[PDB]
Amino acid sequence: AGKKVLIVYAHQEPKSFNGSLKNVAVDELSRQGCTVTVSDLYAMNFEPRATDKDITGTLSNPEVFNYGVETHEAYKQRSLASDITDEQKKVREADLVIFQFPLYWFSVPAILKGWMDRVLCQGFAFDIPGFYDSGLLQGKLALLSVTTGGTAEMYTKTGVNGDSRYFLWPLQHGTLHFCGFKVLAPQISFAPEIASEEERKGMVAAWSQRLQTIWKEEPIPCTAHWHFGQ
């Protein structure tokens, strides 16, 4: 049958390299017949802050507010904020979640960090216990499509940045695997600003071409060994 894809997109500028990577993914996945949804976080003015406004109603323990405890309960009570609830429906129904973003400080831009913090709540994405291979989003795939300022060479073990896989750990393992996702190999488009027009068009085409057979891919083993070696 057909597949559902959610692209969580975090760039301010539609004409950016990120925007182009997002658009070619929509084009290609749409052409295949997939159901495609894009959460364009900056266009949505998506709220990144984890606050008590994320629960509508009386808190369990208002005297000492604990975001995790209160959102866990709100999830069960169906009292989370609308924005969170709407994202959760998209994730729940998705077969594949693609994150499209520029690397900010070896991680996701804060608006996307806020999506992770607020949407992937206890009771929805994981339980304690009920994580990693017992996470609640088991059966789903995730894929990081990241662009960098630094070159591939800088992101090697002997480059000033260390290997690119090193910075993936909190995202792939600590977040996605934790919630039970299987993780498809990352798409890292290095240093588009430095690249020539030809190399840039090539990186966009490579992503589109990869997407043609994305459903045939197997996920990585999201292990310490995969990320760090030895």
Added chain:
Amino acid sequence: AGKKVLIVYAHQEPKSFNGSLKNVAVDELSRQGCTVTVSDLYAMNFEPRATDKDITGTLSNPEVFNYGVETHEAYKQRSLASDITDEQKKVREADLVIFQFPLYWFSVPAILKGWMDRVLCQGFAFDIPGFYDSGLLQGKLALLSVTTGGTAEMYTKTGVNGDSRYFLWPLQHGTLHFCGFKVLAPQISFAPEIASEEERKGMVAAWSQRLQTIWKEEPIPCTAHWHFGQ
């Protein structure tokens, strides 16, 4: 002399375990005679999103928005938003920057990620050249004071989360070292919600006591080996 400290604090609840760690830091560093400032990001409703509103000057290219370029240029003309500008003054003058936060998704809460993204702009925190040991915040000390849900056992090589050092890499190396900070050993207070009240009190006391002698500690070698090696 040389004992200005900025605490960048990211917890919603003054009565929280994080709040207590922040407060004992203020108490002890104030007692020493340090100059102490706290940026209480949630109380400030701090903006986490990197947007064009961060520039108060005329955009150089309003047709195609490039956050990096526009903020770099605006920094040099004192044309960044006042919230950023005010944080930059605090960092510029600080001799030590402590980050106090609960671990969210193997990283900082989004509101604190947004402080990093928006405050540490090119021209202020780094330049090219002017990064890693040559970063523009060279000579300053930084320290991560992190609290977790996961237990100490979980954050070992034999545990499900891997060594805690693994998740520090984007923060300590990719952010702090990149901007020229020397990085003091992290303070990780594991699993306060699982600890008894007395055990929590012990963790708070340990931090207060560590701070008595913080100014003469040796920084870590902020290398891949420290983070991922034996």
